[PDB]
Ligand binder design. Sequence first.
Ligand SMILES: Nc1ncnc2c1ncn2[C@@H]1O[C@H](COP(=O)(O)OP(=O)(O)O)[C@@H](O)[C@H]1O
Ligand SMILES: [Mg+2]
Ligand SMILES: [Mg+2]
Lengths: 50, 80, 48, 191, 518, 192
Amino acid sequence: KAEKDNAEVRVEHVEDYQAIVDAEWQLIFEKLRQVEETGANIVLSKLPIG
Amino acid sequence: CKKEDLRRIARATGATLVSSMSNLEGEETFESSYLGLCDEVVQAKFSDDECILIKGTSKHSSSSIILRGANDYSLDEMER
Amino acid sequence: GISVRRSGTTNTYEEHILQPVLVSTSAITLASECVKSILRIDDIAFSR
Amino acid sequence: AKQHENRLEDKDLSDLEELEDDEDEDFLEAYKIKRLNEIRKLQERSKFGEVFHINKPEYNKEVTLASQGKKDDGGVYVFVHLSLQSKLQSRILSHLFQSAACKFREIKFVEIPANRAIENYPESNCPTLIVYYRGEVIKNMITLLELGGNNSKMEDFEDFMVKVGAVAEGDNRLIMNRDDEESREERKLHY
Amino acid sequence: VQIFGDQVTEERAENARLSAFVGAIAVGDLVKSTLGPKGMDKLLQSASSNTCMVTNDGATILKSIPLDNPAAKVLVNISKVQDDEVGDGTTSVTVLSAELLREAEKLIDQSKIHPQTIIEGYRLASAAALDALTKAAVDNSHDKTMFREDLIHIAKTTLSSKILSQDKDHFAELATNAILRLKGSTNLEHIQIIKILGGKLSDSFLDEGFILAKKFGNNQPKRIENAKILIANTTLDTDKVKIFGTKFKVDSTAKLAQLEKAEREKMKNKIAKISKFGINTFINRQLIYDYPEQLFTDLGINSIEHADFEGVERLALVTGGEVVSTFDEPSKCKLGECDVIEEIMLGEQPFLKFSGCKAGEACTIVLRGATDQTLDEAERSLHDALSVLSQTTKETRTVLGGGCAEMVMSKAVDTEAQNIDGKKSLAVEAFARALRQLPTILADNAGFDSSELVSKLRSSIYNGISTSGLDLNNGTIADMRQLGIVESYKLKRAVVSSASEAAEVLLRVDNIIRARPR
Amino acid sequence: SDREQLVRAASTSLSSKIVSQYSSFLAPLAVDSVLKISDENSKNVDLNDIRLVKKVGGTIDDTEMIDGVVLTQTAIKSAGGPTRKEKAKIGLIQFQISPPKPDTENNIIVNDYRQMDKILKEERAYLLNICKKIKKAKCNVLLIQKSILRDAVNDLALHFLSKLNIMVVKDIEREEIEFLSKGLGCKPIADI
Ligand SMILES: Nc1ncnc2c1ncn2[C@@H]1O[C@H](COP(=O)(O)OP(=O)(O)O)[C@@H](O)[C@H]1O
Ligand SMILES: [Mg+2]
Ligand SMILES: [Mg+2]
């Protein structure tokens, strides 16, 4: 969420606060695992890598 | 109106200064005891100077002096 | 000592001119320490 | 010469409608379309509106990238606040950020703890106010003795924003120019 | 041609050299008067804010004075790092570095020897000097009584040049007792310097425990017997909760009043967590708000606020306990104990004095004087003394002072001067005359004849004895072991090594390139 | 303690000032100020307990030792209910009298027109029950700190205290809390 538009997240529970902060890690690791399964040894990109 | 004037109006006419309408109870109301009393109120205008003449205060008397002269700067000497 | 009202010398205890000993002690003591620091100065060099 | 310019320059879109019956339509509506376009640009630029409580990894992006904005040199001012809760001036400056954030939505208001900002920062120098613009530091402000110190007010903070080029002088949102309705009411009666 | 451009000063091989040597002469003549026990202090006047500074240390003299000469900047930096390493002996580096270049100026002009050949003589001469300095040292620390006596002599030798030269008999006890209380821990942050105006120089007294400039709260008592001390790097301030990004959505103000009740109940439960230990004082790093302050009244707990970062470690080591922030488990984190928590007043500012602590690993030097310029000299003087004595704990070897270290080093250099063939042997002798020039300057500052005492000292040591030295009080040769003059081995090793590298940098120069200033 | 030596010493030691000829009554004033603090250990008596309040007006001859703790600041006179108090109980307030809010900024929403009636009633109710506890404790004089960050008083809170005949003041220095508490014997208060 560097150049992404500012998502106004509003939560009303403490138990959901653990779910919403782990969802950021869940989404970014799902993108890495999908690239990992294909065996791409050299990853390139025009925009920056996290 | 200004703050220092209304204390003298309430002191002369017999009213009390009301900063807000409330009481010790939770309800909100207005009692007739907060109102003052006077005999006559007349608005007068003299040379572009509107002044409300309040006369005949029952509880305590009051007074005001209407100085008259050439201009405002001459009246400043009369005011002093 | 000296009394200023009569403009002459007299007994100061009768005229009630008294002061603490710590005042005169600090005067002689601090004065000697200030002269000790000033006389050790040799050069006046401009700095930042 | 200025009497002709005050008809259009000294009236917003709400005040320009006063001259609808007096002045010509083509003279008035030509400028209202111009001022209406300027209002639309400020709405598109309103990307902010509350204090962004950030953390360091992010500083390298929020504070600086933003300062570049579109990079049309669409620069964006970013007011940083190295907060320190133990100091009294820091809590005052935090209140000014949220108050100004609700008004100036185009300017970014950033806050972060001072202990987390710089390695071993001097606590005496806090609170610190930095202003970024296009990646460059426009003002590295020191504690608020310049802005009155403990007696700092909202009027003094808005005046500082005009000096750094963040807000125009004749902006209608500034308290110096935003005269009260009762003030303008007395002017029309005594005119 | 002109490649360098406009406003660029360039020099070539006769203006380049003799501009660094005259700069080495210019920087050396300033610090000549400051060397020795009878040296005069130099006063520095700032260009802005009318700030004056009385100081004897050669490093501080060169810190403040601006010097655009590039050769003088080398002497500015070597005194800075010498103050960083040992803290004492920066003037000897600048004097010995300048006189080495003064001698080398004559060897280049008179004898017509290459500069590289002069350095090769200094490499062998410096090696012979350090070998004699290593063999001339003596072991220590096997007997604590002798180690106690040698630190007293080192403190007397260090403070003989500073403003404490008259009262060094009393300050030597104050300097050496604080170092032994460290229990081997080599660090100067555990010693505080409290500035007090009034009194005289000898009124500085040794403090039992730890003293600092803080104050109790509004309602706290004056005296508590056997008080348990705790240190919190905590926030007893408006804590907030740390998931910044919490806000309070409110549908009605009925629960908002109960929400503020929960905030007061939150901090009440936190102060209730403090009372489970049953402490008698509470020390916090930052400011304490009034609502925590009122809660310590009924519980019988003292309060101290706004403690510096250094003050936390300085007070915790004396207490013996550790800094606690969680307050969860009362089993671990055993706290210390202090007998007398009563504050005292020295001048117009009250100070919290402690006494009867478990350990004294941190100390505090109380100073008294007339002018702040004297207190600043008192701070820099004892900082050099405590820095030398602190490094003497880790480095045990020492060497005799009083100018005997310079001449005994030059003995082996002169011995190794004969068996070296070529023109570099004259440079080996030039290094010897540089070591001889230090005691020549010690006699000049004292106002006595320098040629006689240097000749008597030089002829005496070659006879076979190696304990003689200069006695500037009487103006004759005497036994240094009787007077008790001794210095550390790493000090003179750093001085000779730094001075050898100082002459080496400036002797390998042939051109000067001064770009345009900004 | 010796009035023959201390009073004469204090008078003859000033000796150069304008109040030297006024020292017939100020030299006893200086002796009586220090004699209240006495100790056998010969301590360094702190002068923080002896506050010198500067008021522009009058003459130096009117200077005299006040028995109680004199306050420098004036009254607020926003309501102006009470004029002169007798047998009053003094309290030192360190918190702020305001509508309910934490120290940080908050957001209050209104989803229905009936919620405003509860908000306006409960905001003064938080001020009302504080005045009830003040009336239960019969505290007639209140001292409120400066509190630049949060509003000390308002027209609503002044109105409830105006009926109970309770004076109020502001602009108290944080360092003078030791002098007021130790002098008047009133412990501070930071919680209702
Ligand atoms: N009491 C003394 N008697 C004789 N020589 C002394 C005495 N104290 C110091 N010296 C000499 O002074 C020289 C330099 O002393 P030092 O403390 O390094 O001064 P500075 O700190 O100014 O360089 C030493 O080489 C030492 O031999
Ligand atoms: Mg020294
Ligand atoms: Mg006098």
